[PDB]
């Protein structure tokens, strides 16, 4: 449900993760992708 996780873009509506890592959590791939500028540079390590 919409509240083990929560968006870092929105809140507990999230419920998708990030292919890729698996430390933060969204809602969509919209957040997804929007983060991307910021979490380009940082998916990859993942810790
Ligand atoms: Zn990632
Ligand atoms: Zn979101």
């Known amino acids: 449900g919409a509240m083990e996780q929560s ?9 998708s993760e990030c ?3 698996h430390k933060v959590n969204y ?3 919209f957040c997804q992708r929007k983060d991307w500028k ?3 540079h940082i998916c990859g390590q993942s810790a």
């Not at 968006?7 to 419920?15: F, L, P, S, T």
Request: net charge negative.
């Open 38 to 40: 910021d979490h380009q």
């Open 19 to 21: 292919t890729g890592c």
């Open 27 to 29: 809602c969509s791939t």
């Open 7 to 15: 968006c870092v873009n929105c809140g507990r509506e999230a419920m």
